[PDB]
């Protein structure tokens, strides 16, 4: 009787019909696979709004113990959950042509490395022929692909010395190609890393938007890229009136020295936000979840943390939450929180 | 400065950027049309869900005094408001090709009748290709001189069976409104336009919630798919009979016999019939066997037909007031005014007088 999603044949329509049935009180949905079951209580994420080129994207959460999130647009749907400490994504596009392109895109890196246990890292899912979704275990995929080390060393810069709606204006770099499932996952992880700190949904509701910009980084250098990006925002007449919002230049790839992203440190405060100061750049590739979250952390004042399980660790470790109490207090205070308010 | 929509150049992106900014607390938006200005307080409609072929469509309302509604999908947006008692829609599609097709579609009937005030009935809005169309349906029907499409006896009493009358258990306001799907099926061979279908669905849902605080009891979820069924003739009674039979014989519809169904098309049936339904065929406790079914036109020029047929499905009879949605002749009004009809509809959705409004 309880609604279920069969991960051996999950398509866009399966995910859409289930998620579109989720009311304001949530819905129990059983995730099923061979040897797997999980009963998740799914609710609409009412804190975050997303448009990708004006396409509305809705987020859904499980309970904390469910370790499950979803993304739903008209063109694609994502189910992401943790199982035995690994993050697994089911990515399903509605259109056959786009689904085939996405499947080829994710399958391609596994062509040169046709090592054992490929299905556990990546699998094309078919109707119970062309795929209806792809399964990617990012933890297993990175072990098989043996990708070069990407990190956050010196990925920040400083300038010299009702919840509030805050727009996070993401701009697709000129000449870059980004995928909606990948961009929205970065946005969801970025928003959830903020709300997990000091009950911050009471103070802020993040509204992500994605457009294309004519700006392109003049070189592979991230510092120069960010200096040029912030300058392009100040010189854009169409951005006038939105200098107090947060901005990200996004791309699929990375910068020189495998830098995943970069941002102006401690550049956003709800009372003094101005002059496009709260800006950064971020990769959006699937294999590096949490980069936008890490850069958004720096924009909100978080410094690098000493714990290897912290989102703000200087090395890329795949963790998506702030653990540093000092960072948590800095971020929350920049969003209007004070200790007397509690969590 | 207060947000505004300039109706002299309103595009899909104008409507989408404004409506997507509407938070839980609503937003003031000034509608501007040269010297005309209306401040509307817009809020998200959280009572109704809509998918058209799995495309999510969100509804927005103004305050009661604003007389304004909006529709937003990824592909299109609609602003509909009343001006001097006339229903005016601004319809904007995102894609240039689709906007051009929609503009040509709505302009075409006016090519055989060039009126002096054609702009007051229909206008392509620019800023070389239109960004939206303005249609004043009341003025458009006067210029186009369409045949008087009516309801006549647009209902069939739902069949009954002899049975000992069981006591009705007095129920309470549910802790959560009951989700009732309104499964709309695009008739085989019919073409329907998303802005038109969603306007019929919005008017249908709003006609129910306006009665006895019914959003406490029901949250309507409209969905649209295509069916292989097509009416075997122009006759609406025979078409409805065949449609309900096609639902019962469809293995894919098994398990959803207790929901509400509409066969939708763009056109009408014989004798200018706009739609037809099984009268008093939906009750939240006894809904079954696809009984709660009807058929409806979705063309823009007949707003409220789906609302009228949904009224009959929920038990409403024809009303004597020409301003009632349930008047026996099509009059363009979108709300139930008959207290008898209101009580019948609300009782079929779980309401009782002790619950109040
Ligand atoms: O729309 C869906 O769910 C999938 C996509 C390819 C064909 N069927
Ligand atoms: O086998 C896999 O890759 C994942 C684990 C849970 C469901 N499917
Ligand atoms: O293949 C199946 O069983 C389901 C139906 C749509 C795609 N997944
Ligand atoms: O998507 C990318 O990674 C490319 C790199 C330079 C500009 N954009
Ligand atoms: O931009 C910021 O984050 C700092 C914090 C206090 C006010 N300005
Ligand atoms: O809404 C927009 O921006 C474009 C302009 C015409 C078609 N859609
Ligand atoms: O004169 C009237 O109003 C009647 C009502 C149904 C058809 N014409
Ligand atoms: Mg679309
Ligand atoms: Zn960093
Ligand atoms: Zn009638």
How does DSSP assign A102-129, residue by residue?
A: HHHHHHTHHHH---S-HHHHEEEE----
Q: Do B59 and B18 reside in the same domain of the chain? A: yes
How many Cβ atoms sit within 10 Å of the Cβ of residue A159? 11
Q: How far is CA B50 from the centre of its chain?
A: 11
Count CB-CB contacts under 10 A for residue B331.
16
Experimentally, how was this structure solved? Answer: X-ray
Residues A69/A62, Cβ–Cβ less than 8 Å: yes
How many CA atoms within 13 Å lie on the side-chain side of B124? 17
Q: How far apart are CA A243 and CA A110, in angstroms?
A: 43
- A20 at interface of B, judged by CB pairs closer than 8 A: yes
For helices A291-299 and A180-195, angle between their N-to-C axes, nearest 10 degrees = 50
- Residues B327, B342: Cα–Cα separation, whole Å: 14
A207 known member of a binding site? no
What gap in Å lies between CA B114 and CA B109, rounded to an integer?
10
Q: What are the Cα distances from residue B145, in Å, to B177, B217, B232?
A: 43, 41, 29
Same-domain check for residues B188 and B49: no
- With an 8 Å Cβ cutoff, are B221 and A16 in contact? no
- Say if residue B112 is in the same domain as residue B208: no
**Cα–Cα distance between B304 and B302 in angstroms, integer?**
6
Question: Tell me, what DSSP letter sits at residue B84?
Answer: T
Residues of A in Cβ contact (< 8 Å) with B56? 20, 56, 58, 72, 74
Per the structure, how many domains does chain B have? 2
Give the minimum alpha-carbon distance from A95 to chain B in angstroms, rounded to a whole number. 12
**Residue among A111, A250, A115 at smallest CA distance from A169:** A250
Indicate if A22 and A118 belong to the same structural domain: yes
User: Does B291 lie in the same domain as B150?
Assistant: yes
Which residues have CB under 8 Å from B105's CB, separation 6+? B193
A214 flagged as catalytic: no
Q: What is the DSSP letter of B145?
A: T
CB B279 within 8 A of CB B247: no
The CA distances from residue B126 to B8, B71, B117, B134, B160, in Å, are: 7, 20, 18, 11, 55
The secondary element (H helix, E strand) that includes residue B119 is helix B118-121
Chain B 194-223, CB below 8 Å of chain A: which residues? 219, 221
Q: How many CB atoms lie within 10 A of CB B84?
A: 7
In 3D space, the residue among A286, A292, A289 whose CA is nearest the CA of residue A109 turns out to be A286
Residues with CB under 6 A from ligand 7: B 328-329
What are the C-alpha distances in Å from A124 to residues A37, A76, A286, B166? 20, 15, 16, 55
Decide if B54 and A25 are in contact by the 8 Å CB cutoff: no
User: What is the rounded distance in angstroms from the CA atom of residue A299 to the CA atom of residue A292?
Assistant: 10
Tell whether A139 and A152 lie within a shared domain.
no
Residue at token pair 């499947």:
A103
For residue A66, give Cα distances in angstroms to A6, A206, A295: 17, 23, 26
| CA distances, B16 to each of A187, A202, A248, B21, B58 (Å) | 20, 26, 21, 8, 11
B-contacting residues in A 151-190 (Cβ below 8 Å): 162, 165
Pocket test for ligand 2, best of A5, A10, A33 (most atoms within 8 A of CB): A33
Q: Which domain holds residue B213?
A: 146-357
Q: Which of B329, B330, B332, B333 gets mutated to test ligand 7 (max ligand atoms within 8 A of its CB)? A: B329
Determine if ligand 4 sits within 6 Å of the CB of residue A321: no
Domain match, B276 and B244 both:
yes
Resolution of the experimental model in angstroms, please?
Answer: 1.9
Question: Nearest residue CA, atom 1 of ligand 2?
Answer: A120
Of A96, A120, A146, the last residue of a domain is: A146
Question: Sign of dihedral through CA atoms A334, A335, A336, A338?
Answer: negative
Task: For chain A, give the number of residues.
Answer: 343
The residues facing B58 across adjacent strands are B72
What's the CA gap between B175 and B162, in Å, rounded? 34
- A261-264 and A279-283 strand pairing: antiparallel
A12 to chain B: nearest residue by CA? B54
CB contact (8 A) between residue A54 and residue B17: yes
Catalytic residue among B254, B309, B339, B352: B309
- In the annotated binding site of B for Zn(2+), the residues are 154, 308, 312, 318
Residues A195 and A125 grouped into a single domain: no
Q: Which residue has the tokens 């994710």?
A: A106
Q: Do B138 and B156 have their domain in common?
A: no
Centroid of chain to Cα A19: 19
Residue B309 has what DSSP assignment?
A: H
Can you tell me the distance from the alpha carbon of A292 to that of A336, in angstroms, rounded to the nearest whole number? 21
Q: Which residues contact B222 (CB under 8 A, 6 or more apart)?
A: B48, B49, B50, B51, B181, B182, B184, B201, B204, B205
> Residue B5, SS3?
strand
A 259-318 near B (Cβ less than 8 A) = none
Ligand 7 centroid vs B301 CA: distance in angstroms? 19
Are B194 and B73 contacting, i.e. CB atoms less than 8 angstroms apart?
Answer: yes
Two tokens, residue A136: 């990617």
Burial code (b: 16+ CB inside 10 Å, e: under 16) for B205-243 equals bbbbbbbbebbbbbbbbbbbeebebebeeebbbebbbbb
Residue among A13, A20, A25 whose CB faces B56 most closely: A20
Tell whether B72 and B158 lie within a shared domain.
Answer: no
Same domain, B176 and B314: yes
- Asked if the Cβ–Cβ distance from A55 to B74 is below 8 Å, we say yes
CB contact set of A297 (below 8 Å; sequence gap of 6+): A193, A311, A312, A322, A327, A331
Candidates B10, B12, B16, B104: which one to mutate for ligand 6, based on the most atoms within 8 Å of Cβ? B12
Do A119 and A129 lie in one domain? The reply is yes
Domain boundary, last residue among B94, B125, B145: B145
Spatial separation of the C-alpha atoms in residues B282 and B182, rounded to whole Å:
11
Residue of chain A whose alpha carbon sits nearest to that of B224: A17
Give the containing element (helix H, strand E) for B220. Answer: strand B218-226
- Interface A-B, measured as beta-carbon pairs within 8 A, has a size of 51
Q: What is the dihedral of CA A131, A135, A138, A141, to 10 degrees?
A: -60
Q: Which of A295, A45, A47 is nearest to A162 (CA)?
A: A47
Beta pairing partners, A76: A93
Active-site pick, A149, A295, A325, A338: A295
B310/B306 Cα distance (integer angstroms): 6
Most B CBs within 10 Å, among A20, A44, A75, A76, to test the B interface: A20
The Å distance, Cα B77 to ligand 8 centre, comes to 13
Question: What residue of B is the nearest CA neighbor of A210?
Answer: B17
Cβ atoms of A173 and A94 within 8 Å: the answer is no
CB contact under 8 A, A165 and B58: no
Angle at A164 between CA A160 and CA A166, to 5 degrees: 55
Residue B200: in which H helix or E strand, if any? helix B194-209
Query: Of B85, B116, B145, at which residue does a domain stop?
Result: B145
Cα–Cα distance for residue pair B114/B106, rounded to 1 Å: 14
Residues 6+ apart with CB under 8 A from B12: A54, B76, B77, B92, B93, B94, B99, B131, B132
Residue B282 structure tokens? 């939906």
């Amino acid at each position: 009787v309880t609604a279920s999603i069969d991960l051996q044949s999950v398509s866009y329509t399966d995910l859409a019909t289930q998620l579109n049935d989720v009311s304001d009180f949530g819905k129990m949905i059983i995730l099923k696979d061979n040897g797997f079951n999980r009963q998740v209580h799914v609710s609409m994420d009412k804190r975050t709004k997303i448009q990708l080129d004006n396409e509305n994207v809705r987020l859904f959460n499980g309970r904390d113990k469910d370790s499950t999130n979803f993304i739903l647009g008209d063109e694609f749907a994502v189910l992401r959950f943790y199982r035995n400490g690994e993050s697994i994504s089911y990515i399903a596009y509605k259109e056959a042509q786009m689904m085939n392109e996405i499947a080829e895109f994710y399958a391609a890196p596994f062509k040169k490395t046709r090592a054992i246990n490929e299905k556990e890292a990546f699998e094309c899912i078919y109707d119970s022929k062309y795929p209806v979704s792809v399964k990617i275990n990012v933890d297993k995929a990175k072990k098989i692909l043996n990708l070069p080390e990407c990190d956050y060393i010196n990925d920040y810069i400083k300038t010299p010395q009702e919840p509030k709606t805050v727009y996070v204006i993401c701009l697709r770099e000129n000449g870059s190609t980004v995928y909606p499932n990948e961009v929205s996952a970065q946005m969801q992880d970025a928003a959830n890393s903020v709300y997990a700190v000091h009950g911050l949904k009471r103070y802020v509701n993040l509204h992500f938007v994605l457009y294309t910009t004519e700006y392109a980084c003049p070189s592979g250098n991230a510092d120069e890229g960010l200096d040029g990006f912030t300058a392009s925002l100040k010189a854009n007449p169409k951005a006038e009136g939105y200098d107090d919002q947060i901005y990200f230049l996004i791309r699929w790839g990375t910068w020189d020295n495998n830098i995943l992203g970069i941002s102006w440190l401690n550049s956003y405060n709800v009372n003094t936000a101005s002059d496009f100061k709260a800006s950064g750049m971020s990769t959006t590739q699937l294999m590096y979840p949490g980069v936008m979250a890490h850069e958004l952390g720096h924009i909100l004042g978080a410094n690098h943390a000493d714990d290897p399980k912290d989102l703000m660790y200087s090395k890329y470790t795949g963790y998506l939450f702030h653990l540093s109490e000092k960072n948590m207090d800095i971020i929350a205070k920049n969003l209007g929180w004070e200790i007397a308010d509690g969590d």
